[PDB]
Amino acid sequence: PLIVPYNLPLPGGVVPRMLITILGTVKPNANRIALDFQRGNDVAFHFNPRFNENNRRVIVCNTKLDNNWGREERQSVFPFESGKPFKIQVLVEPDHFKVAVNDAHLLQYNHRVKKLNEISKLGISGDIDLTSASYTMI
Numbered sequence: 001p002l003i004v005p006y007n008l009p010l011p012g013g014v015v016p017r018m019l020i021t022i023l024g025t026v027k028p029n030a031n032r033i034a035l036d037f038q039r040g041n042d043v044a045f046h047f048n049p050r051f052n053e054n055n056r057r058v059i060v061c062n063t064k065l066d067n068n069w070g071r072e073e074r075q076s077v078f079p080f081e082s083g084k085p086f087k088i089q090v091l092v093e094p095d096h097f098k099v100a101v102n103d104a105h106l107l108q109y110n111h112r113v114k115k116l117n118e119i120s121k122l123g124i125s126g127d128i129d130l131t132s133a134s135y136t137m138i
């Protein structure tokens, strides 16, 4: 097991063909999960499942630049379930991050932050038991 919040260094940043895999279990009465791909203080890609936003489950994605959040991208497919084990895969592609959950494609997020090789940490936080977090090149 891992302690949350967990920091996964991404040496030399991200690059197309880099695949991040996160394994964990959602706690019983979870409120949120967050993945934060950071470029220094900026958040290049924030991926944030919300279990109870006005009694709806939604995933919010965004970018934080100079401490300011940008325009959220939201879609409503919500594959997580409180209490259950999950796998998140984030594949870096030339134009976007591509996210699959439990082997099913979920969403893609276009690169707003262009300096991919400066996106050198992934923070994993929220209401999870975190089993593992790693990367490989495909």
Ligand SMILES: OC[C@H]1O[C@@H](O[C@H]2[C@H](O)[C@@H](O)[C@H](O)O[C@@H]2CO)[C@H](O)[C@@H](O)[C@H]1O
Pocket (backbone or CB within 6 Å): 046, 048, 060, 061, 062, 069, 070, 072
């Ligand atoms: O955009 C990601 C960012 O959202 C913040 O929450 C927003 C919320 O989504 C929006 O509906 C409301 O109008 O403004 C809030 C503050 O920007 C979260 O606080 C932050 O953690 C990120 O998840």
